[PDB]
Design a protein around this ligand. Structure first.
Ligand SMILES: O=P(O)(O)OC[C@@H](O)[C@@H](O)c1c[nH]c2ccccc12
Ligand SMILES: O=P(O)(O)OC[C@@H](O)[C@@H](O)c1c[nH]c2ccccc12
Ligand SMILES: *Cc1c(COP(=O)(O)O)cnc(C)c1O
Ligand SMILES: *Cc1c(COP(=O)(O)O)cnc(C)c1O
Lengths: 254, 394, 394, 254
């Protein structure tokens, strides 16, 4: 939680929004995924959102579904992902790292033990994609015991009760699914800072999100497509990723 | 907040992305409203009787039990329109979709049986039905694909991900997350998130209600046990529900043991898997040691599912129902036995239930027992499968 | 000398070799005895209800008649065990065989549908069934051959003569001429020598009796017309019998018109053939100018027969029933129409009856009329046939 | 009828039984069938029994069924058969000729017109295989109007009433299906002379039939097999037929 508080305080001192890419750990192989992640950071990512490949990821869109399949073809497992996460934190001490998880990989060997391993490797937040606020009690409790922010999605079909729960229970950032009314109510309820996500693939959508009052934006399919289109030229993949991330990040600056 | 409890003991719940919660709550409220509406009840009863052919017979099979003290009846869901029990609850869910003001049905299917069921109810009730299907399943289930399209459903071949059933599901739920105001997701078994396990049980519970009245008429007492196969759990919960409070009546659920539990190639998570969270629910499932969902196997495609409905897991936990497994070869023997001795060709799914009643009889042939097997479907669809196996063994 | 009249006006009779007369007389006396025996009647009713699933539904089809003044119901013989009306009378004839002290059934089959019906009744009632089948039919009707052998029947491939159905028949009757003390010849339609046209009608007449009670319950009056397809004539005489004396009720029989009457490639002897003597009876048949029996044709194998039962020829002659024909393409359109608008896949035989009701409705859409079609069977067996035609036309 | 009366009177003066072969007209072609028939007669046939190929001959055994199929392959029709019958009678003035018919070919253009055509070509009797005595009225009446004997089968399952009807209605010969009791009752009832038929394929069965009191025997499948076995050598076919018929006929002599 501390890393997100530190980053949003610093960005607000600079009147800047955050730019947060999403990638699947291990896509398209462990080594290339570590180089992709260091490029995203070197190009200006403020924080990272990282998926652990799961066999039945019913909320992933097709671009992401194909990222999971490449990672599984390279033999990536959750254990390997945690090893990658430890090395990423060992290289970058302050960037907030959040995971995007499916409930079975968290529940599998004990919900408390999953959040203990996240704390041990240096993860700062976890979003469990198939746990709604109604079922989140054991996940959010374990997260807070291990100083991990529990992230909640605030959908476009949210009602007032949902807004209040998301404000009260979430920490780190509020995942705002692509918004002025939702944004204003979240701030009224003192929710964690909002990051707009879904469909963010150009500079003008980053600036629009910050102008709407969000603290930043998340982009995943646009980033994953660059991987998918350059599998045969890893050098070109990294150069294209650097170009895309520095343009998106420049859109967030005052 | 829900109207009904979403859990059966530890099992069940609503493990979906937040954006699908309003669709689930809407459905639960529509269902609770429907269950108190005499007109909804009359409309459902009318389609069940005059369209689908309920009540179904309860057939005593004397030839098969000859020389033993077992009396065996078969609940004839194989005579229901479409040839399987699946028809009962898709009519009920189509009526719920119409009650919510929806004119579209969304479904996904692997084997193609739930797809056909959803397409026939949608044709009857004036609903536009789109059925997502992994391109690999499309390729292998030509007959069922053609039945669905004859009945006007749009069969959408899914190439994304691994182009299998889990990918048809993801696409179907993604669609449903954007279109739930006008479309209803017709889930085909007694599993998935609440309120589906509850709705599917209540819209299949006429199987056990009829069985109770029919056995009391013919024998003057309740069964010693009622026995049914268990994929996701809808035909078995349909047979067991009305007997739950009749504590003298055994409830026996039969999962597929495939090539043998010890091989790992089976579909028996309730007894041989481990609790996990997937498909919107907390339930027993077949999983790897690091939590990936494993592949299931059965000679019968209808039972080839790696999890089980949460009410079954609950009934097992408390000892009210007992769960066993039957292998491919035991199911094939029961299939041949029924054809030869009663002139009834049973679905291979149902043949697992029948195989277990035959073992109860043959193991202890002088125990006096009155057993009912749910013959969930007919097996004309399985004749090539059976033929090619037996031809292969010579 | 017989107990009952063997003729319907000019049609019918017992045109068999002298050596088969004692078997026919024995059968007629057993049948007359059975019809007065309350126990025989109770046993037959019991199998019909608890084994075969009677009564069958009577389904109103509102979607198909929308925008017209026709109200259409379908008598659901497609929901009977085995998927066709054929089951009713083979149970009745199996009981007659047992009443005569016989433990063996003899049958012949081309298409394989009557073979399956005979094998399932024989499996249920403990009878050894041998079914003669031309080697050419054996080759082309693998699925039905496999169902019969699964049910314990001996399928005997006939290579003699032209190795077709007429040769299976000759062998079956030759066998029967030597073994009638212990074997019963189960004829599968309302044709052949007396007393078969009579017995098959009386053991199918519950279709029309039920239809009468059901239509009076639902509409409070009798149908303007009842409509059924006509191969040999058993499902149509079953539907018409109980309405014969209700003179306001039209009786419409539909023969197959194949590629079109004018082509010669059809199965419509009643209206387009000429009286002759064959298969033990005097009846309309398709013949060459010098009296050889011609080959019949229909897209539907179940209607591909070159003659018709004598009671139909009689009812036509006196003007009590009317007979029409429906071509392959009209039957295929009715098949697609029912699948899409009611979610019911009809047999192609039954689709001929449905095609004629659809023409009665569409030709005169503002005539108020209440029609019942006998949906004699289900059409899962016809999906490849329909699929390959439609694929061929693109 | 006259030809049969003349033949049975002559054979009885010689204390001999009759030997009557059956063949299908037109098998295996018209010309070869005419030569077969003249060989049967030259070898000692007393009378002939001749089948007209029909499409659905449900009482023919497999040997005969195959004889019909050969005749149909040669394009033989009933009209061609009547042309053959006229020429056979034009060559042989006294031998009784009887036909073995199926009811549709008799009924087809008028039962009376069929027996008129038989009379015109010189046929002496007709056996309609699928007409039992119960249905024979129109056939036997038309036969007697055209001086044709109506032939009836007396089966092994005959009862007393059947015997009396067969005795009363039949003329020419009584076809006795393979018998002392049946034979004695037939003579008691003044039936037409009996010819035993079915399975007669050796000399000792001809003599046994005559010893049992029958007036003779009919043989068809044994004769038709000789045709079927020698299709490729018509000369050999005729020599084998001559050998078989003269042995069978010699068995009937006193
Ligand atoms: O790909 P998009 O449209 O840029 O949105 C990011 C989204 O894919 C990433 O945040 C994500 C991956 N899987 C999820 C599951 C649920 C919610 C969000 C996600
Ligand atoms: O062939 P066999 O066994 O020798 O019997 C003569 C019989 O075939 C001939 O008389 C015949 C041919 N077709 C028939 C039909 C009915 C009665 C008799 C026949
Ligand atoms: C689909 C099917 C099943 C399995 O599903 P349940 O939901 O477990 O009933 C069993 N039997 C038949 C015939 C089926 O079609
Ligand atoms: C066999 C069959 C028929 C034809 O026979 P009938 O004796 O004329 O009834 C018609 N419909 C179905 C479905 C059949 O199986």
């Amino acid at each position: 939680m501390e890393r997100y508080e530190n980053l949003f305080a610093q960005l607000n001192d600079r009147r800047e929004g955050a730019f947060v890419p999403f990638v699947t750990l291990g896509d398209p192989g462990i080594e290339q995924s570590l180089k992709i992640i260091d490029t995203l950071i070197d190009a200006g990512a403020d924080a990272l959102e990282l998926g652990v490949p799961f066999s039945d990821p019913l909320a992933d869109g097709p671009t992401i579904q194909n990222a999971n399949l490449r990672a599984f073809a390279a033999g990536v497992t959750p254990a390997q992902c945690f090893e990658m996460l430890a090395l990423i934190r060992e290289k970058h001490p302050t960037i907030p790292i959040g995971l995007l998880m499916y409930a079975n990989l968290v529940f599998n060997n004990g919900i408390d033990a999953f959040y203990a391993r996240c704390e041990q490797v240096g993860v700062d937040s976890v979003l469990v994609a198939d746990v709604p606020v109604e079922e989140s009690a054991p996940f959010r409790q374990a997260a807070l015991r291990h100083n991990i922010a529990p992230i909640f999605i605030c959908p476009p079909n949210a009602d007032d009760d949902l807004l209040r729960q998301v404000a009260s229970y979430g920490r780190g950032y509020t995942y705002l699914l692509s918004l002025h009314h939702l944004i204003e109510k979240l701030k009224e309820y003192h929710a964690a800072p909002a990051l707009q996500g879904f469909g963010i693939s150009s500079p003008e959508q980053v600036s629009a999100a910050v102008r709407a009052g969000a603290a930043g934006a998340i982009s995943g399919s646009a980033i994953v497509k660059i991987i998918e289109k350059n599998l045969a030229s890893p050098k070109q993949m990294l150069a294209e990723l650097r170009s895309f991330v520095s343009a998106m990040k420049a859109a967030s600056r005052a | 907040t829900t109207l009904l409890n979403p859990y059966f003991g530890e099992f069940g719940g609503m493990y979906v992305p937040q954006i699908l919660m309003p669709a689930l709550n809407q459905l639960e409220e529509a269902f609770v409203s429907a269950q108190k509406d005499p007109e909804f009840q009359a409309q459902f009863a009318d389609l069940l009787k005059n369209y689908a052919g309920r009540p179904t017979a309860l057939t005593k099979c004397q030839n098969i039990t000859a020389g033993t003290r077992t009396t065996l009846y078969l609940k004839r869901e194989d005579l229901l329109h479409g040839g399987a029990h699946k028809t009962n609850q898709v009519l009920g869910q189509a009526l719920l979709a119409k009650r919510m003001g929806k004119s579209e049905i969304i479904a996904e299917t692997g084997a193609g049986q739930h797809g056909v069921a959803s397409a026939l109810a949608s044709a009857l009730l004036g609903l536009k039905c789109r059925i997502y299907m992994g391109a690999k399943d499309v390729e292998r289930q030509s007959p069922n694909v053609f039945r669905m399209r004859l009945m006007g459903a749009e069969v959408i071949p899914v190439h994304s991900g691994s182009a299998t059933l889990k990918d048809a599901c993801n696409e179907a739920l993604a669609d449903w997350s954007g279109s739930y105001e006008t479309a209803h997701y017709m889930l085909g078994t007694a599993a998935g998130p609440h309120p589906y396990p509850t709705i599917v049980r209540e819209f299949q519970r006429m199987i056990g209600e009829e069985t109770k009245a029919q056995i009391l008429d013919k024998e003057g007492r309740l069964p010693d046990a009622v026995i049914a196969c268990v994929g996701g759990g809808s035909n078995a919960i349909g047979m067991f529900a009305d007997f739950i409070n009749d504590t003298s009546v055994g409830l026996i659920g039969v999962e597929p043991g495939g090539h043998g539990i010890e091989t790992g190639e089976h579909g028996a998570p309730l007894k041989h898997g481990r609790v996990g969270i997937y498909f919107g629910m907390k339930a027993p499932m077949m999983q790897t040691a690091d939590g990936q969902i494993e592949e299931s196997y059965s000679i019968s495609a209808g039972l080839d599912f790696p999890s089980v409905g949460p009410q079954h897991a609950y009934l097992n936990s408390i000892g009210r129902a007992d769960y066993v497994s039957i292998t491919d070869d035991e199911a094939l023997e029961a299939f041949k036995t029924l054809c030869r001795h009663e002139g009834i060709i049973p679905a291979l799914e149902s043949s697992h239930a029948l195989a277990h009643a035959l073992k109860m009889m043959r193991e202890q042939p002088e125990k006096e027992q009155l057993l009912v097997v749910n013959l969930s479907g007919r097996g004309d669809k399985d004749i090539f499968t059976v033929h090619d196996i037996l031809k292969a063994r010579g």
